[PDB]
């Protein structure tokens, strides 16, 4: 109640951009793991589950040949906590899933086209 | 409005763009300061934009008229203040039914630079080429081009036939040998 | 049981990493004992260190193999002293997110090191 | 709970510890059936005298290119008079499907890799 109105406690693996939407700007106030000040009436937490999050992505890729083959990567990942506001201003609180298919589909394809994979 | 009448409370990071229905749309760059909100629907609408992906391929012939399709993983982040400045056309989430034209023009000019196989053996080259073309046209849309991926290559059943037949030629070399 | 609550009745491996609520982790990790765990200075984040036999299969090739089917049983625990770190960096999981990272990567490279007959020859040395 | 957890006479002669984990010394000893009594909550029941259960473990395997043959190795799994003090902490649950499969199978692989039989 009032405790939640003044502060927020994270046991671990989660951050939150306590961004002031109403009357000012407070986006620098990133939730340090644990207890941290924020007022939800004005200051809205953008919560990021920064734990080692897997994601297996599969795609046919190229090679030093005309042959393409299906290669897959189990993307374990953590959003960069200390730069959450920056990405929040750019891509927001879903980039952790939306940017990866733009990333891995060239990580793999570049590397495998350079080799005969 | 009511709770935001004389107030707005700028939603930085979510970029609620105010559409001044009282005068059509805002000619003011939102949210550069707290804006007065007239009850005649002069109100903010969240256009965070924000990861805006569009993974679209284009059917086009190649250097040797091959059916190449590359799903350009288009990703736009409309320029913070420019999209509000685009109030003469689309102040809202820049219409994603208009944006794919960037690929129908560019990717068609990009395909036949490499004929399929050259891309398969050389990705980075054409990937940078298409990203530069897309960046120029993203500027023409007033949008920040994010990492656009040149991926999911469909190129030609004649080439897949040719590479499986290439392996058949090697298999026949060894098969006839033994 | 009434006494099972409050007093942390616990057997092999159930490492209740003890946290406060919340500035960080308490100096100790307990999973074999019986003492009070008040979740303001003692939050019971239990990682069951009881060993985990995971037989993970891998279908792959080698220096010359195309179809070889290799199954690997890994029996393991997590490091108690690193469970606090794990909790904040992985969560309550000490596996399943990272279980493939200690099977698939290694076996793919290891089998690539060996070949037709040397997987068979080396056996425990492949496992080595 | 408490009453039955403290009872340690019990008709029989079985080897089992009621291990006082809060001070870990007892671990290397047992309670023999015919005793009474021990602390229901601080001490924990571990079965040392495990009957000779005939566990059959089977595995195909070869050598160089020698065809894969299936060794059938059955294990009687004698009682653990003084082996559970470490086994329960390591495995806890029935080793028959936790480590004994490797104890047999890895050996079987070495067996045929040598070429026998």
UniProtKB/Swiss-Prot annotation, chains A, D:
Q: What is known about its processing and modification?
A: Phosphorylated. Tyrosine phosphorylation is indirectly stimulated by IGFBP6.
Locate the N6-acetyllysine modifications and list their residues. Answer: 114
According to the UniProt record, list the residues that bear Phosphotyrosine.
Answer: 95
Q: Where is the region LC3-interaction region?
A: 88-91
Description of what induces expression? Expression increases approximately 3-fold upon entry into G1 phase compared to other phases of the cell cycle. Also induced following inhibition of mitochondrial protein synthesis by thiamphenicol.
| Tissue specificity remark | Expressed in myoblasts.
Top-level division of the source organism's lineage: Eukaryota
Q: Which subcellular locations apply to this protein?
A: Mitochondrion inner membrane; Cytoplasm; Nucleus; Cell membrane
Q: How does it assemble?
A: The mitochondrial prohibitin complex consists of two subunits (PHB1 and PHB2), assembled into a membrane-associated ring-shaped supercomplex of approximately 1 mDa. Interacts with ESR1, HDAC1 and HDAC5. Interacts with ZNF703. Interacts with STOML2. Interacts with ARFGEF3. Interacts with SPHK2. Interacts with COX4I1; the interaction associates PHB2 with COX. Interacts with MAP1LC3B (membrane-bound form LC3-II); the interaction is direct and upon mitochondrial depolarization and proteasome-dependent outer membrane rupture. Interacts with IGFBP6 (via C-terminal domain). Interacts with CLPB. (Microbial infection) Interacts with SARS coronavirus/SARS-CoV nsp2 protein.
Summary of the function given for this chain in its UniProt record: Protein with pleiotropic attributes mediated in a cell-compartment- and tissue-specific manner, which include the plasma membrane-associated cell signaling functions, mitochondrial chaperone, and transcriptional co-regulator of transcription factors and sex steroid hormones in the nucleus. In the mitochondria, together with PHB, forms large ring complexes (prohibitin complexes) in the inner mitochondrial membrane (IMM) and functions as a chaperone protein that stabilizes mitochondrial respiratory enzymes and maintains mitochondrial integrity in the IMM, which is required for mitochondrial morphogenesis, neuronal survival, and normal lifespan. The prohibitin complex, with DNAJC19, regulates cardiolipin remodeling and the protein turnover of OMA1 in a cardiolipin-binding manner. Also regulates cytochrome-c oxidase assembly (COX) and mitochondrial respiration.
Q: What is known of its domains?
A: LC3-interaction region (LIR) is required for interaction with MAP1LC3B/LC3-II and for Parkin-mediated mitophagy.
Q: Which family does it belong to?
A: Belongs to the prohibitin family.
Q: What is this protein called?
A: Prohibitin-2
Query: Which gene underlies this protein?
Result: PHB2
Q: What range of the parent protein does this fragment cover?
A: 34 to 150 of 299
From Swiss-Prot, chain B:
Q: What is this protein called?
A: Prohibitin 1
Natural source organism: Homo sapiens
Q: GO CC annotations?
A: cell surface; cytoplasm; early endosome; extracellular exosome; membrane; mitochondrial inner membrane; mitochondrial prohibitin complex; mitochondrion
- Found in which tissues? Widely expressed in different tissues.
Q: Which residues carry this modification: Phosphothreonine?
A: 71
> What keywords does the record list, in alphabetical order?
Acetylation, Cell membrane, Coiled coil, Cytoplasm, DNA synthesis, Host-virus interaction, Membrane, Mitochondrion, Mitochondrion inner membrane, Nucleus, Phosphoprotein, Proto-oncogene
| GO terms of biological process kind | antiviral innate immune response; B cell activation; cellular response to interleukin-6; DNA biosynthetic process; epigenetic regulation of gene expression; mitochondrion organization; modulation by host of viral RNA genome replication; negative regulation of androgen receptor signaling pathway
Phenotypic consequence of residue 85 to H:
In a breast cancer sample; somatic mutation
Coiled-coil zones = 157-178
Q: Which domain of life is it from?
A: Eukaryota
Q: Where in the cell is it found?
A: Mitochondrion inner membrane; Nucleus; Cytoplasm; Cell membrane
Q: Which family does it belong to?
A: Belongs to the prohibitin family.
Q: Does the keyword Signal apply?
A: no
Explain what induces or represses this protein's expression.
Expression increases approximately 3-fold upon entry into G1 phase compared with other phases of the cell cycle. Also induced following inhibition of mitochondrial protein synthesis by thiamphenicol.
Instruction: Report the principal subcellular site.
Output: mitochondrion
| Task performed by this protein | Protein with pleiotropic attributes mediated in a cell-compartment- and tissue-specific manner, which include the plasma membrane-associated cell signaling functions, mitochondrial chaperone, and transcriptional co-regulator of transcription factors in the nucleus. Plays a role in adipose tissue and glucose homeostasis in a sex-specific manner. Contributes to pulmonary vascular remodeling by accelerating proliferation of pulmonary arterial smooth muscle cells. In the mitochondria, together with PHB2, forms large ring complexes (prohibitin complexes) in the inner mitochondrial membrane (IMM) and functions as a chaperone protein that stabilizes mitochondrial respiratory enzymes and maintains mitochondrial integrity in the IMM, which is required for mitochondrial morphogenesis, neuronal survival, and normal lifespan. The prohibitin complex, with DNAJC19, regulates cardiolipin remodeling and the protein turnover of OMA1 in a cardiolipin-binding manner. Regulates mitochondrial respiration activity playing a role in cellular aging.
Q: Would I find Magnesium among this entry's keywords? A: no
An example Gene Ontology molecular-function term: transcription corepressor activity
On this chain, the residues bearing N6-acetyllysine are: 108, 166
């Amino acid at each position: 109640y009032g405790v939640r109105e003044s502060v927020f406690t994270v046991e671990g693996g989660h951050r939150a951009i306590f961004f002031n939407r109403i009357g000012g700007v407070q986006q620098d106030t990133i939730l340090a793991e644990g207890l941290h000040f924020r007022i939800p009436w004005f200051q809205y937490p953008i919560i990021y589950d920064i734990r080692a999050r897997p994601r297996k992505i599969s795609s046919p890729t190229g090679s030093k040949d005309l042959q393409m083959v299906n290669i897959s990567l189990r993307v374990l990942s953590r959003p960069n906590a200390q730069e959450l506001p920056s990405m929040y201003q750019r891509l927001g609180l879903d980039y952790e899933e939306r940017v990866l298919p733009s990333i891995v589909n060239e990580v793999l394809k570049s590397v495998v086209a350079k080799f005969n994979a | 409005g009511v709770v935001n009448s004389a107030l707005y409370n700028v939603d930085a990071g979510h970029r609620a763009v105010i559409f001044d229905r009282f005068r059509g749309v805002q000619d003011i760059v939102v949210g550069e300061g707290t804006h007065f909100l007239i009850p005649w629907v002069q109100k903010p609408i969240i256009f965070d934009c924000r990861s805006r992906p569009r993974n679209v391929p284009v059917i086009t012939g190649s250097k040797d008229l091959q059916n190449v399709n590359i799903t350009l993983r288009i990703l736009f982040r409309p320029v913070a203040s420019q999209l509000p400045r685009i109030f003469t056309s689309i102040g809202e989430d820049y219409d994603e039914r208009v944006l794919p034209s960037i690929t129908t023009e560019i990717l068609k000019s990009v395909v036949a630079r490499f004929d399929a196989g050259e891309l398969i053996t050389q990705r980075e080259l054409v990937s940078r080429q298409v990203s530069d073309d897309l960046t120029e046209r993203a500027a023409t849309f007033g949008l920040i081009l994010d990492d656009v991926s040149l991926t999911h290559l469909t190129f030609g059943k004649e080439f897949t036939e040719a590479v499986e037949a290439k392996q058949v030629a090697q298999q026949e070399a060894e098969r006839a040998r033994f």
